[PDB]
Amino acid sequence: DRELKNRVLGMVPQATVSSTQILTDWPELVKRVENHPHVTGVAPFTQLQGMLTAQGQVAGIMVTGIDPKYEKNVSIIQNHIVAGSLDSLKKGEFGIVLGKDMADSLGLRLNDSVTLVLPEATPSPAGVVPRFKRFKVVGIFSVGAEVDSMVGYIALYDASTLLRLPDGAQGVRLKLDDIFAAPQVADDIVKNLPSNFYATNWTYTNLFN
């Protein structure tokens, strides 16, 4: 199945060069990384974990802040948009692009409201102070059973604004000519970066303790 490989491989972050500090200079990291050997695509990202809620329903979700103009270089989500468009993800508009199954679970259609809730630790007995922000559905995708029910996309700078941070990115995502070269490439790139940077790759994965 040639399409299955592109569906699975298109959704896996092959490698990232990430930072513990928000990168307002992320486009210089893109230019610095794009010409590294084996790199065929680069895009900024910020990875958030939270819940969506609407009309009494709650669903877990992993939200990635993206720039759609770059995201085409690493993703296939733009090829599987069933309603709306990724290009509606703009700073300050607080649109969100959801998977078809996720949107169905919450009774959501295009242009419907949905609340994004992010947990935030606190030493108080409550344990969490949730930060919640209202979003509008501007896109719906349909890729695969797993991804359709767990992941959503928002504007890159709405992701940082939700974090009370300046406009920037957590890191850049890499697409490669050989996914099995992802460990070496990310390790090599990080070697010449300052200590705030670190590498991830798709081989990083379920503890019983």
| Nearer of residues 60 and 87 to a copy of itself, judged by Cβ | 60
Selected from 28, 107, 177, 204, the binder of a copy of itself by CB under 8 A is 204
Q: How many residues bind a copy of itself (CB under 8 A)?
A: 69
**191 is a contact residue toward a copy of itself (CB under 8 A):** no
If phi over 0 gives left and psi between -120 and 50 gives alpha, with beta otherwise, what is residue 83?
A: beta
Total residue count of the chain as it appears in this document:
209
Measuring CA to CA, which residue among 97, 93, 103 is closest to residue 64? 97
Measuring CA to CA, which residue among 11, 25, 29 is closest to residue 190? 29
Selected from 37, 69, 145, 166, the binder of a copy of itself by CB under 8 A is 145
Q: Which stretch binds a copy of itself (CB under 8 A): 29-37, 46-54, 73-81, 86-94?
A: 46-54
Q: Which residues contact 92 (CB under 8 A, 6 or more apart)?
A: 155, 157, 158
- What are the backbone angles phi and psi of residue 7, rounded to the nearest 5°? -70, -45
Q: Which structure tokens are listed for 99?
A: 């998977």
**25 is a contact residue toward a copy of itself (CB under 8 A):** no
**49 is a contact residue toward a copy of itself (CB under 8 A):** yes
Measuring CA to CA, which residue among 1, 4, 48 is closest to residue 22? 48
- Where along the sequence are the contacts to a copy of itself (CB under 8 A)? 1, 4-5, 8-9, 11-13, 16, 18, 22, 46-51, 53-62, 115, 117-119, 122-130, 132, 144-147, 149-151, 163-164, 170-171, 178, 180-181, 183-184, 187, 195, 198, 200, 202-209
